[PDB]
Amino acid sequence: DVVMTQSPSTLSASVGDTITITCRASQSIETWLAWYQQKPGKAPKLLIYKASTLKTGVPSRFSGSGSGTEFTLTISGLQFDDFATYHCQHYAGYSATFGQGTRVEIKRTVAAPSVFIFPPSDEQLKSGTASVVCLLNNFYPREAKVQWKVDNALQSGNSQESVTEQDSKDSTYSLSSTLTLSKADYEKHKVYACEVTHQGLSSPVTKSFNRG
Amino acid sequence: DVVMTQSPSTLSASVGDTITITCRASQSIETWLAWYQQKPGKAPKLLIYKASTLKTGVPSRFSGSGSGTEFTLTISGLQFDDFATYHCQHYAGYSATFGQGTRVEIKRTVAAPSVFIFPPSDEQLKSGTASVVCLLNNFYPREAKVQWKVDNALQSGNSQESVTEQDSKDSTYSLSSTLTLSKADYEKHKVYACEVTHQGLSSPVTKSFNRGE
Amino acid sequence: EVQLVESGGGLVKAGGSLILSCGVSNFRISAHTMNWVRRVPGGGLEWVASISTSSTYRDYADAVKGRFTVSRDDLEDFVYLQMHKMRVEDTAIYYCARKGSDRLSDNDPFDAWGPGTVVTVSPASTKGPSVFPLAPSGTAALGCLVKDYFPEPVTVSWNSGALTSGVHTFPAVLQSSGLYSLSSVVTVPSSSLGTQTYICNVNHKPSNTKVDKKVEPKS
Amino acid sequence: EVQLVESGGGLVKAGGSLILSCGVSNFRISAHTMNWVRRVPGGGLEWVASISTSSTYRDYADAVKGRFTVSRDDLEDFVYLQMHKMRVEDTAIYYCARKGSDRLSDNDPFDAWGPGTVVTVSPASTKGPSVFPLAPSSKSTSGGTAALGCLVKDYFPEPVTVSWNSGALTSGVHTFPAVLQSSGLYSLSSVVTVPSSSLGTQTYICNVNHKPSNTKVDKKVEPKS
Ligand SMILES: OC[C@H]1O[C@H](O[C@@H]2[C@@H](OC[C@H]3O[C@@H](O)[C@@H](O)[C@@H](O[C@H]4O[C@H](CO)[C@@H](O)[C@H](O)[C@@H]4O[C@H]4O[C@H](CO)[C@@H](O)[C@H](O)[C@@H]4O)[C@@H]3O)O[C@H](CO)[C@@H](O)[C@@H]2O)[C@@H](O)[C@@H](O)[C@@H]1O
Ligand SMILES: OC[C@H]1O[C@H](O[C@@H]2[C@@H](OC[C@H]3O[C@@H](O)[C@@H](O)[C@@H](O[C@H]4O[C@H](CO)[C@@H](O)[C@H](O)[C@@H]4O[C@H]4O[C@H](CO)[C@@H](O)[C@H](O)[C@@H]4O)[C@@H]3O)O[C@H](CO)[C@@H](O)[C@@H]2O)[C@@H](O)[C@@H](O)[C@@H]1O
């Protein structure tokens, strides 16, 4: 197996900058390398093949170069449409391997998340289900960690998270974690809390409420 | 298109009897006919092909005959293992068609079902679901009809039925129909009723209850 | 001791799709015409599809043509059945059967069957969402939870589009029940919690469902 | 332009199976090597499988090898991916991609992609049942016979075995075949008829055993208040 490694994993920059993404192969792959662009919820688009050849339709601000084990993709003059994930691929006749992808996001100053907790509504509660929501509003960077504590007991396997894309106005992210429980299991405990760890915080911030 | 029709739809007999199942084709198919045995939850087994040829391994008590548009499958000396469904099939080079199937059951006297109705338990009710169960116990034959009425309104599409096979002791059947509703929808009505129609009854039996009592 | 085995059955919503595979043992499928048959809950068998050698002829029952497709893979001994635009009467036990005998003639019966795989098609093709309030407990946060709907998408506005600043509508999540759930939140000034009214408008076009729900700080 | 479209994604339990199809438009697959790639939730792409022209070479990633199978149908332009013994790390968006270019060489990139289909593998392979009583009602008793039982609902997978009074009660017991509910969970009910006079002395407990989750629940059924 040939192993492809991209660098960096996340590249923060501003519109108009010139950025470079590196792709390293564990072995020599000559010029059998391609670069793909992918946006959330869409299919990957082939940008470059044979290390340097631009596919018909790709803007000239994209370029690719390199050989052997070192390859680079350069975006000269980042436009708003260029913010996406970029994958390098070693494609063989009957197999292929990808890198981890490089997410190119809009660079901004670190912002702490505004944390809120929402208990389940009584209308939903009487139906038999309790959804406890925890919201992280306008933070940066994207990496955050949310843990649920019910009577000091750490929850696992009963919550789902959902993250927005970069806001066009403030270039921040927002996250929502939903802890779903049955009415009985919800009625069996008292204090519900979400503890949030993020680079913009000096320590994990805990938002809680007492059932009642 | 050729349509294959089996007769009867249900054939009741006793162990040791000799039974015949008829398969009728709308058009002449000569001897392009096969007979298959299938038991519940299992795969169909090929018994006879080309109208009369018994496949290697099939007991000699099975036999098939006929041609053109008339075919018969005869089991001479029914054993307990022979109680199953039997399908006749007209098989063409690149297509095929089956009959409706003939279920061979143990013959017994007609028995009326003892009907019972169960309201949803409070434990289930406060969790958000109300299951109302209707039970028809020990009836014969298998054909029965169960209709749900909620505040005299006939329900359709919110109930599921489940039938047992012939009981090894009395050769009867039992059926359970479950009407499932949300807690709100259950709290929105008063009287719940199961209406049962069966040949062993002179008239439909209705078991009902008022939500609360 | 010839054997066949199906895979891929399960639960499907009305109008959905489902693909079944069929593998074999102690023989090769290349020489045999392969068939898909289904046992309906009524008890009878119904011929679904047939594919000849070299895929020269592909035949379907009238009830499934234009919706089903049969394929074969002789080099690895596999048969496939795609079922699209599935109806409720497609609910059945699907068996994969072989046409053959001791000598291969031009028209032999189904001498080998697989155990079958269960395919259940629920009648509900769409479901409308339940909308619950996320009540505001400086700056306050409020919203509404749009839970248990199928399929995507769901659009959410605030105050018929008047309120746009500070609104975050999160991508839908697929719950373990098979239904989608999302939440839409807004940041507001605290002082506006008593005067300004907050209504979230949830539109689910697949079910033509429209729900307008307002959110209070609770008593 | 050329287009591809996947079908067959959805929810799967750990250890289950799922087959995906891929149809095309405005080109033929016969000349093209076809591939399956998946985007994991982490964000990166992962090559899953490849099938050559005429199905001569079939290659798989190590993480799916021995569990996945790729097939092609050139005469009707379809591609298939069987996924067996599915693991939770198989959760991804699966795209069916074409190997090709403006002119067909011996090694071209993936120039055409489908929109992808979501395949989610839940970690829970089994679920224990909820058992509720079907109590002998004040009015639902005719003659000298009463009926009682318990409803074993929302479990996965089959089977569930039900006894009464640790096996003492066998006469008159009917355990019905399981029903598959629209939620994907199974539901069953077990009933027994008993003499009415025995309602005061003899206690009635149904023992529900679901070995796939090894869950055992003994529930007693009394008349309501
Ligand atoms: O299909 C139902 C039966 O399937 C299995 O038995 C097979 C069946 O094959 C039928 C036979 O029909 C003929 O008309 C041809 O279509 C034949 O295939 C020919 O054509 C393809 C291209 O279409 C060629 O690649 C083949 O090589 C073959 O061509 C030769 O054979 C022709 C027929 O002799 C001849 O005209 C031609 O010139 C070539 O010489 C197709 O296979 O019957 C076969 C014979 O009984 C049997 O070997 C097959 O396996 C089996 O399951 C049966 O039980 C089913 O009823
Ligand atoms: O597969 C990766 C590339 O796929 C696309 O390009 C195709 C590729 O085909 C590879 C070529 O490899 C050879 O080894 C053969 O396997 C060939 O197929 C032969 O064998 C089959 C039976 O297995 C026959 O039916 C075929 O007719 C063919 O046999 C003839 O052709 C042979 C090669 O010329 C010859 O040796 C033989 O004697 C016969 O005359 C298989 O097709 O490369 C082709 C050439 O570059 C191209 O046309 C194919 O479309 C494409 O997506 C690429 O990007 C992939 O990298």
Side-chain angles (χ1 to χ4, degrees), chain A, chain B, chain C residues 1-136 138-219, chain D:
Chain A
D1 271 348
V2 177
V3 183
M4 311 301 297
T5 55
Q6 291 187 224
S7 181
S9 295
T10 309
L11 201 161
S12 302
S14 304
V15 48
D17 288 7
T18 295
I19 64 171
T20 60
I21 302 173
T22 311
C23 181
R24 191 183 321 275
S26 61
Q27 301 171 23
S28 178
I29 65 177
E30 293 193 356
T31 51
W32 301 119
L33 185 107
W35 290 98
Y36 300 89
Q37 180 188 74
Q38 189 180 198
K39 302 189 175 179
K42 300 301 194 64
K45 300 176 74 175
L46 170 64
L47 297 177
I48 294 177
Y49 59 98
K50 261 291 208 60
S52 61
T53 297
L54 287 76
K55 185 184 181 179
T56 312
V58 179
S60 296
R61 62 177 177 275
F62 295 93
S63 63
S65 54
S67 60
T69 68
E70 300 174 347
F71 305 86
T72 186
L73 166 67
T74 306
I75 315 180
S76 303
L78 276 180
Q79 300 185 1
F80 186 60
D81 190 66
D82 297 333
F83 288 102
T85 306
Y86 291 95
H87 312 272
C88 67
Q89 171 210 39
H90 167 53
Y91 55 98
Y94 304 107
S95 62
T97 39
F98 294 85
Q100 340 70 56
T102 298
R103 186 167 53 85
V104 178
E105 57 169 8
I106 303 167
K107 176 166 170 293
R108 69 152 286 152
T109 59
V110 170
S114 292
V115 188
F116 306 88
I117 186 164
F118 301 94
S121 60
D122 294 339
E123 183 182 16
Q124 182 199 23
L125 190 55
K126 67 186 64 176
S127 76
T129 297
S131 296
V132 192
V133 177
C134 182
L135 162 64
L136 314 186
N137 209 32
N138 303 142
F139 56 93
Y140 188 92
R142 184 166 180 271
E143 296 78 41
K145 175 201 201 56
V146 178
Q147 270 166 142
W148 283 97
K149 292 189 183 73
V150 179
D151 278 342
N152 315 317
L154 195 145
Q155 304 297 289
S156 61
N158 49 8
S159 59
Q160 297 186 249
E161 301 187 3
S162 174
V163 58
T164 57
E165 312 183 39
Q166 265 191 303
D167 199 73
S168 58
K169 308 308 177 62
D170 48 55
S171 306
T172 64
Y173 301 96
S174 295
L175 188 147
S176 70
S177 178
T178 307
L179 168 66
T180 304
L181 294 150
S182 63
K183 172 172 174 303
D185 294 340
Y186 179 76
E187 297 281 343
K188 200 249 163 293
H189 298 88
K190 181 66 65 178
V191 289
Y192 293 77
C194 52
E195 182 192 58
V196 175
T197 76
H198 188 281
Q199 310 179 14
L201 304 167
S202 305
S203 49
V205 175
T206 295
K207 293 295 183 178
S208 65
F209 70 89
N210 275 260
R211 179 187 69 82
Chain B
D1 272 349
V2 177
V3 184
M4 312 301 296
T5 303
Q6 291 187 224
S7 181
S9 295
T10 309
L11 201 161
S12 302
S14 304
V15 165
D17 288 6
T18 70
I19 63 171
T20 61
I21 302 173
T22 50
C23 182
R24 192 182 321 275
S26 60
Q27 302 171 23
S28 178
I29 65 178
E30 290 197 356
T31 51
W32 299 120
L33 182 109
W35 290 98
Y36 301 89
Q37 180 189 74
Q38 188 182 197
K39 302 189 174 179
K42 301 301 193 295
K45 301 175 75 175
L46 171 64
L47 298 177
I48 295 177
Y49 61 99
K50 264 176 88 63
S52 61
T53 297
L54 203 77
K55 186 184 181 178
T56 311
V58 179
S60 296
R61 61 177 177 275
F62 294 92
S63 63
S65 54
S67 60
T69 67
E70 302 172 347
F71 305 87
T72 61
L73 166 67
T74 71
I75 315 180
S76 303
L78 277 180
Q79 299 185 1
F80 189 60
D81 190 66
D82 296 333
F83 288 103
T85 306
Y86 292 83
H87 313 271
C88 67
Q89 171 210 39
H90 168 53
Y91 56 99
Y94 302 108
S95 62
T97 180
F98 294 86
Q100 284 69 19
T102 297
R103 187 169 55 85
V104 178
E105 57 169 8
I106 303 168
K107 176 166 55 185
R108 189 219 185 271
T109 59
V110 170
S114 292
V115 187
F116 307 89
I117 186 165
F118 301 94
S121 60
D122 294 338
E123 182 183 16
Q124 183 199 24
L125 189 54
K126 66 185 62 176
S127 76
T129 297
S131 296
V132 191
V133 178
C134 183
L135 161 64
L136 312 64
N137 209 32
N138 303 20
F139 56 95
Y140 187 92
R142 185 166 181 271
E143 298 81 41
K145 174 201 200 55
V146 179
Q147 270 166 300
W148 283 97
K149 292 190 183 74
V150 179
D151 278 341
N152 208 15
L154 195 144
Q155 304 297 289
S156 63
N158 50 7
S159 58
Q160 299 187 95
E161 301 188 3
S162 174
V163 195
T164 57
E165 311 184 39
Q166 265 190 303
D167 199 72
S168 57
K169 308 204 175 188
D170 48 56
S171 306
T172 63
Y173 302 95
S174 296
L175 188 147
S176 70
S177 178
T178 307
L179 169 66
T180 304
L181 293 150
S182 62
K183 173 173 175 303
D185 294 339
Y186 179 76
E187 297 280 343
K188 202 153 104 294
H189 298 278
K190 183 65 64 179
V191 43
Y192 292 76
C194 186
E195 181 192 58
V196 174
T197 310
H198 188 281
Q199 308 181 14
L201 304 166
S202 305
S203 50
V205 176
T206 295
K207 295 295 183 177
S208 65
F209 71 89
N210 275 261
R211 179 184 69 83
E213 290 82 287
Chain C
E1 214 165 295
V2 181
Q3 292 177 8
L4 295 82
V5 51
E6 303 86 353
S7 301
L11 190 68
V12 180
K13 298 296 165 186
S17 310
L18 186 69
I19 305 122
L20 317 170
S21 81
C22 172
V24 305
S25 294
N26 300 331
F27 82 103
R28 312 303 299 262
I29 62 153
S30 71
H32 295 272
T33 282
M34 302 299 293
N35 300 257
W36 287 93
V37 183
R38 67 185 176 187
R39 174 172 215 187
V40 292
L45 299 178
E46 176 178 11
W47 173 78
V48 171
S50 80
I51 184 164
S52 63
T53 64
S54 307
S55 303
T56 306
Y57 308 96
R58 305 166 123 104
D59 297 301
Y60 306 130
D62 293 331
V64 307
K65 186 173 295 181
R67 306 190 294 107
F68 288 19
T69 305
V70 59
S71 294
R72 63 190 303 154
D73 175 7
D74 306 317
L75 276 303
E76 295 285 331
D77 295 308
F78 285 110
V79 186
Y80 299 93
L81 186 65
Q82 298 178 48
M83 308 173 296
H84 297 257
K85 304 197 200 176
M86 306 194 56
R87 310 196 254 263
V88 172
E89 54 273 30
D90 293 329
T91 302
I93 304 98
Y94 284 74
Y95 317 88
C96 168
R98 166 186 89 176
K99 283 183 73 69
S101 176
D102 296 329
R103 195 187 185 269
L104 275 49
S105 81
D106 295 332
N107 184 25
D108 301 74
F110 296 180
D111 65 334
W113 296 69
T117 180
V118 183
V119 174
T120 304
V121 179
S122 57
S125 76
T126 322
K127 171 156 189 176
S130 302
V131 179
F132 305 109
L134 306 172
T139 302
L142 47 87
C144 58
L145 169 74
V146 181
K147 177 187 179 65
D148 294 339
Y149 65 89
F150 189 102
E152 296 206 69
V154 153
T155 59
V156 173
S157 304
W158 280 96
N159 291 344
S160 308
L163 176 53
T164 308
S165 177
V167 179
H168 292 287
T169 304
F170 293 96
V173 298
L174 182 57
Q175 307 183 88
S176 56
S177 68
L179 305 183
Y180 292 92
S181 182
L182 65 77
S183 53
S184 181
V185 302
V186 188
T187 258
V188 299
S190 301
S191 58
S192 66
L193 287 183
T195 60
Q196 182 63 255
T197 176
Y198 300 110
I199 301 177
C200 75
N201 332 116
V202 186
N203 184 16
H204 184 233
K205 181 208 78 176
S207 62
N208 332 277
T209 298
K210 241 183 179 181
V211 169
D212 301 313
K213 169 145 294 181
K214 104 157 177 172
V215 187
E216 68 169 20
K218 105 127 193 302
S219 76
Chain D
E1 214 167 30
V2 307
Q3 291 178 8
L4 297 81
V5 51
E6 302 86 354
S7 301
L11 252 182
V12 181
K13 102 256 166 185
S17 311
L18 185 69
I19 304 94
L20 317 170
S21 81
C22 173
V24 305
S25 294
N26 301 332
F27 82 101
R28 302 296 300 264
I29 63 153
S30 72
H32 297 272
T33 282
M34 302 299 293
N35 300 257
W36 287 93
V37 183
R38 67 186 175 186
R39 175 171 215 188
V40 293
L45 298 177
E46 176 178 11
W47 173 77
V48 172
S50 82
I51 184 164
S52 64
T53 65
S54 307
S55 305
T56 305
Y57 307 97
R58 305 165 192 247
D59 297 83
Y60 306 86
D62 293 331
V64 307
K65 188 174 297 181
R67 306 190 293 107
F68 290 19
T69 305
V70 59
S71 294
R72 63 189 302 153
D73 176 7
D74 306 317
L75 279 181
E76 294 283 274
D77 296 308
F78 286 111
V79 186
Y80 301 93
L81 184 64
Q82 299 178 49
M83 311 169 66
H84 297 257
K85 304 199 200 76
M86 305 194 55
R87 311 196 187 109
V88 63
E89 54 272 30
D90 293 329
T91 302
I93 305 98
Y94 286 74
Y95 319 87
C96 156
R98 166 186 89 177
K99 196 169 180 59
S101 177
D102 297 329
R103 195 187 185 269
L104 279 187
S105 81
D106 294 332
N107 185 26
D108 300 333
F110 298 0
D111 64 333
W113 297 69
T117 179
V118 184
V119 175
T120 305
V121 179
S122 57
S125 180
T126 62
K127 171 156 189 176
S130 302
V131 179
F132 304 109
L134 307 172
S137 188
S138 312
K139 290 81 184 175
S140 190
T141 305
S142 62
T145 302
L148 47 87
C150 57
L151 169 74
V152 181
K153 81 167 309 182
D154 295 340
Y155 67 92
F156 187 77
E158 296 206 70
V160 153
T161 163
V162 173
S163 62
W164 280 97
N165 291 344
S166 308
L169 175 54
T170 61
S171 177
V173 178
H174 291 286
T175 304
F176 293 94
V179 154
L180 182 58
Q181 306 184 269
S182 304
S183 69
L185 305 183
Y186 290 87
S187 181
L188 169 154
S189 53
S190 182
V191 301
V192 63
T193 56
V194 299
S196 302
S197 57
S198 66
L199 229 62
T201 60
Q202 182 63 254
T203 57
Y204 297 109
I205 301 177
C206 74
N207 331 115
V208 185
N209 185 16
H210 183 233
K211 182 163 79 175
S213 63
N214 197 8
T215 298
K216 50 201 72 174
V217 169
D218 300 77
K219 170 145 294 181
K220 101 159 176 173
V221 187
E222 65 171 24
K224 42 169 293 184
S225 78

